[PDB]
Amino acid sequence: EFMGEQPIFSTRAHVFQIDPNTKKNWVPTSKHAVTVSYFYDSTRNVYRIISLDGSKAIINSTITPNMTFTKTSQKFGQWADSRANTVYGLGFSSEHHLSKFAEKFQEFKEAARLAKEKSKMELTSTPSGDLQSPLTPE
């Protein structure tokens, strides 16, 4: 498992990607199966898909409400990440794991929507040739 802050959900998959600025389509990111996890980053108040290959992150995708995870072939699903400017693809060990991951994606999509809503102003009546505003913005 992991040390320190635990992820909410983890699975095993081969990782693939599409880079917009190369002519190739799908390319293998990992040679072998790696752990793929949904993680709540409390300081940033966002949910992230985190995948490590050895000591480095090969997936660091911040879930947004408008993201779409699509199942497109046997045991394989994909989502586009506009922020990372990359499409990620996951090859699973069974159809069960593919579908479970997809279900979780929608769960984290809703949570991300609520997180953004939660991410407080004080309204007031108007303060009861001189200037009353601050001299500088900051």
From Swiss-Prot:
Modified residues (N-acetylglycine): G4
Domain of life: Eukaryota
Polar residues composition bias: residue spans: 133-138
Cell compartment(s), UniProt: Cytoplasm; Postsynaptic density; Synapse; Cell projection, Dendritic spine
Impact after mutating T72A: Normal binding
UniProt domain WH1: residue ranges: 3-112
Effect listed in the UniProt record for changing T72E: Disrupts binding to SHANK3
Tissue localization of expression: Highly expressed in cortex, Purkinje cells of the cerebellum, hippocampus, striatum and olfactory bulb. Isoform 1 and isoform 3 are expressed in skeletal and cardiac muscle.
UniProt signal peptide: none
Domain notes: The WH1 domain interacts with the PPXXF motif in GRM1, GRM5, RYR1, RYR2, ITPR1, SHANK 1 and SHANK3. The coiled-Coil domain forms an antiparallel tetrameric arrangement.
Stated role: Postsynaptic density scaffolding protein. Binds and cross-links cytoplasmic regions of GRM1, GRM5, ITPR1, DNM3, RYR1, RYR2, SHANK1 and SHANK3. By physically linking GRM1 and GRM5 with ER-associated ITPR1 receptors, it aids the coupling of surface receptors to intracellular calcium release. May also couple GRM1 to PI3 kinase through its interaction with AGAP2. Differentially regulates the functions of the calcium activated channel ryanodine receptors RYR1 and RYR2.
UniProt record similarity statement: Belongs to the Homer family.
The protein's assembly and partners: Tetramer; this tetrameric structure is critical for forming the high-order complex with SHANK1, which in turn is necessary for the structural and functional integrity of dendritic spines. Interacts with GRM1, GRM5, ITPR1, DYN3, RYR1, RYR2 and SHANK3. Interacts with IFT57 and OPHN1. Isoform 1 and isoform 2 encode coiled-coil structures that mediate homo- and heteromultimerization. Interacts with SHANK1; forms high-order polymerized complex with a mesh-like network structure, at least composed of SHANK1, HOMER1 and DLGAP1; the complex formation is SHANK1 multimerization dependent.
Protein name, per record: Homer protein homolog 1
Complete-protein stretch covered: 1 to 143 of 366
